[PDB]
Design a protein around this ligand. Structure first.
Ligand SMILES: Nc1ccn([C@@H]2O[C@H](COP(=O)(O)O)[C@@H](O)[C@H]2O)c(=O)n1
Ligand SMILES: [Cl-]
Ligand SMILES: [Cl-]
Ligand SMILES: [Zn+2]
Length: 370
């Protein structure tokens, strides 16, 4: 009983990309069980190089996990998951504990995107006593879910409340959220020793083989985009697109025509004279309409922007639509404007982004502004 199994799960993309990067950085030979919704790995050479198995779904992964634990050889399981979707790690914990094999469990939660930060803002609006009360309930909430007596509510106090039960690290998009004007002292006390700031400078220390492993995992290689950046000597701008749940194609086309004016009263930070790139949202299907109307260099929409970040393929400047993308973007890239579908003072997404200095209050715009 000296073996550790590492479990990797995610429904989105950001935790997956960060999880891939940690696996590569650590280069451990522990057995790994992997289930990533957006990144099915069928590459057996890749999987063998990390000692991994891939599972198409959570119940299959759990089945293999449990049989391994039944061998009596498993000292510890490290579960790596998605904070918003902590429910998936709850069900993994439930299955391990049920077996009653005295398995050590340790947890790494990676933020999903903007949702955690919208929820943190909302939670910070609560009076302090109500925050403390919700927190007081969290340990029992989580334990009841693990015991199987109640469903799991992914409220702030619950998803950030696991360090009360297990050795837990929260890898956060912006760990410095607890150092803004938001009243979050109540939650900070719970997790202050359990927080890591997500890092994006791994490639600075990676050797070639590590870099190549990242390309192989993601199916992304930054060579084409890096050539596109340098093709012309002008500074590079990426427009961050959204999907129809937030904006129409026409509204984004209109935003781009306003931005191209050197003297807009709305978009004061002009994109005139820049090399313009369009990065579409992975789920948008109107990207060609926008790209054509503006003669923009296309960055394939299915590439998650965090792959651009991790591979150091960043532009000089950025602007566009309210998005999780802006939360992981390094602060060295200039943010010219963000448009929101939204009275901005009551908008949690806008306010958290202002508080984190992701965007100047003067550069926040509403789609109704054109
Ligand atoms: N233009 C965009 C918009 C979103 N995205 C990806 O989609 C994820 C979720 O973004 P949203 O919050 O915008 O839906 C981001 O973390 C990023 O991976 C992107 O890569 N390019
Ligand atoms: Cl350029
Ligand atoms: Cl769409
Ligand atoms: Zn140019």
């Amino acid at each position: 009983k000296n073996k550790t199994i590492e479990v990797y799960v995610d429904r989105a993309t950001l935790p997956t990309i960060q999880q891939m990067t940690q696996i590569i950085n650590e280069n451990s030979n522990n057995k790994k069980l992997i289930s990533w919704s957006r990144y099915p790995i069928n590459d057996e050479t890749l999987l063998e190089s990390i000692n991994g198995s891939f599972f198409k779904n959570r119940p299959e992964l759990i089945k293999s996990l449990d049989s391994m634990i039944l061998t009596n050889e498993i000292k510890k399981v490290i579960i790596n998951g998605n904070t918003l979707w902590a429910v998936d790690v709850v069900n993994i914990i439930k299955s391990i504990e049920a077996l009653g094999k005295k398995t050590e469990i340790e947890l790494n939660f990676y933020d999903d995107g903007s949702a955690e930060y919208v929820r943190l803002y909302d939670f910070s609006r609560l009076p302090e006593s109500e925050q403390e009360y919700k927190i007081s309930l969290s340990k029992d909430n989580i334990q009841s879910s693990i015991n199987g007596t109640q469903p799991f509510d992914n409220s702030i106090e619950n998803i950030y409340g696991f360090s009360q039960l297990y050795p837990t690290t929260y890898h956060m998009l912006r760990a410095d959220i607890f150092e803004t004007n938001l009243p979050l002292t109540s939650l900070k006390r719970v997790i202050s020793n359990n927080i890591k700031q997500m890092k994006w400078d791994y490639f600075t220390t990676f050797n070639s083989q590590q870099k190549n492993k990242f390309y192989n995992f993601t199916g992304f290689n930054p060579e084409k985009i890096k050539e596109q950046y340098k093709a012309s000597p002008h500074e590079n701008f990426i427009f961050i697109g959204t999907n129809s749940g937030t904006a129409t194609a026409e509204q984004q086309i209109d935003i781009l025509t306003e931005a191209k004016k050197p003297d807009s009263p709305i978009i004061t930070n002009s994109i005139q004279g820049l090399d313009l790139f369009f990065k579409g949202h992975p789920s948008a299907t109107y990207n060609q309409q926008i790209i054509d109307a503006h003669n923009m260099i296309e960055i394939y929409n299915k590439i998650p922007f965090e792959a651009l970040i991790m591979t150091d393929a960043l532009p000089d400047a950025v602007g566009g639509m309210g998005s999780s993308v802006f939360f992981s973007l390094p602060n060295t890239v200039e943010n010219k404007f963000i448009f929101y579908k939204s009275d901005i003072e009551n908008n949690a997404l806008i306010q958290v982004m202002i508080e984190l200095n992701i965007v100047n209050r003067n550069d926040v715009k509403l789609i109704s502004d054109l």
